[PDB]
Amino acid sequence: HISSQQHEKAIKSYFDEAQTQGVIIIKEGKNLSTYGNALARANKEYVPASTFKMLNALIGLENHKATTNEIFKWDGKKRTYPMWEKDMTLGEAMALSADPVYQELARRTGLELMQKEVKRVNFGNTNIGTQVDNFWLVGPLKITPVQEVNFADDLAHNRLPFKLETQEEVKKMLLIKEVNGSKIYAKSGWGMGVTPQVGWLTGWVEQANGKKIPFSLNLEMKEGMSGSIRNEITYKSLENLGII
Numbered sequence: 368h369i370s371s372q373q374h375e376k377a378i379k380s381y382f383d384e385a386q387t388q389g390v391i392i393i394k395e396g397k398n399l400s401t402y403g404n405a406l407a408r409a410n411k412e413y414v415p416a417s418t419f420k421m422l423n424a425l426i427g428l429e430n431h432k433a434t435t436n437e438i439f440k441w442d443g444k445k446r447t448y449p450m451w452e453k454d455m456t457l458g459e460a461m462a463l464s465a466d467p468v469y470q471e472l473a474r475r476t477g478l479e480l481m482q483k484e485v486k487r488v489n490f491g492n493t494n495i496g497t498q499v500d501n502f503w504l505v506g507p508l509k510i511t512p513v514q515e516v517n518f519a520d521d522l523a524h525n526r527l528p529f530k531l532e533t534q535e536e537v538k539k540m541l542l543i544k545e546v547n548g549s550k551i552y553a554k555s556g557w558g559m560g561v562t563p564q565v566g567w568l569t570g571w572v573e574q575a576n577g578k579k580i581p582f583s584l585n586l587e588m589k590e591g592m593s594g595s596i597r598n599e600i601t602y603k604s605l606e607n608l609g610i611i
């Protein structure tokens with residue numbers, strides 16, 4: 368009974384109140400809905416940053432460069448964040464968004480196979496350039512919020528061109544929240560070495576009844592913003608719309 372004008376206003380205000388510019392795309396069935404305080408971002412290209420980890424893991428697992436219980440050892444070198452200084456599975460690394468593990472996995476895949484697989488699944492502008500272990504951070508790979516939500520929709524419904532088992536193993540890594548019999552699966556992203564900086568949270572909601580509603584939030588991150596503003600705007604938006 369809440370008007371769409373009111374939903375649009377409330378979700379715009381969540382971005383306004385985080386002092387950022389952003390959009391959140393929701394897809395119900397085949398219909399895309401765009402909300403937020405910067406709608407024109409929906410079809411603009413940004414680096415995928417750590418959202419690329421979902422496809423890196425699909426490619427690595429499909430091509431047997433890793434398994435889901437293999438432990439990627441910390442090599443003992445200092446990492447940007449102390450929580451990355453430990454040994455972890457692809458799964459743990461997904462939740463911590465640990466770039467060093469994903470960089471190692473990309474190097475096992477190698478530049479040639481990586482290029483072929485990123486073209487094969489049709490991700491973003493599909494260009495990875497000549498450096499297998501940084502193309503998702505500063506270019507040249509870019510992707511729009513519409514393309515990210517369509518990727519999430521594909522993964523949520525096992526539609527990507529990988530085995531069903533590869534897709535389920537990656538999906539199991541992405542569970543971030545359970546809210547009233549609803550499950551939220553998502554990957555966050557924060558591209559710090561592009562200007563302006565870009566924040567992402569892309570995934571889907573699995574409702575109690577089995578329906579999956581994919582989303583993609585995309586915003587401008589600014590110095591001394593907390594990463595958790597991405598989750599908060601998302602949960603508020605999905606709750607406002609009655610998806611969770």
Ligand SMILES: *C(=O)[C@@H]([C@@H]1NC(C(=O)O)=C(S[C@@H]2CN[C@H](C(=O)N(C)C)C2)[C@@H]1C)[C@@H](C)O
Binds near residue numbers: 417448556557559594
């Ligand atoms: C991916 O985009 C980069 C990493 N991704 C994230 C993220 O999406 O939050 C971070 S932030 C890093 C992870 N956990 C630490 C933390 O204190 N929290 C935000 C919970 C800091 C990285 C920048 C990746 C390419 O570096």
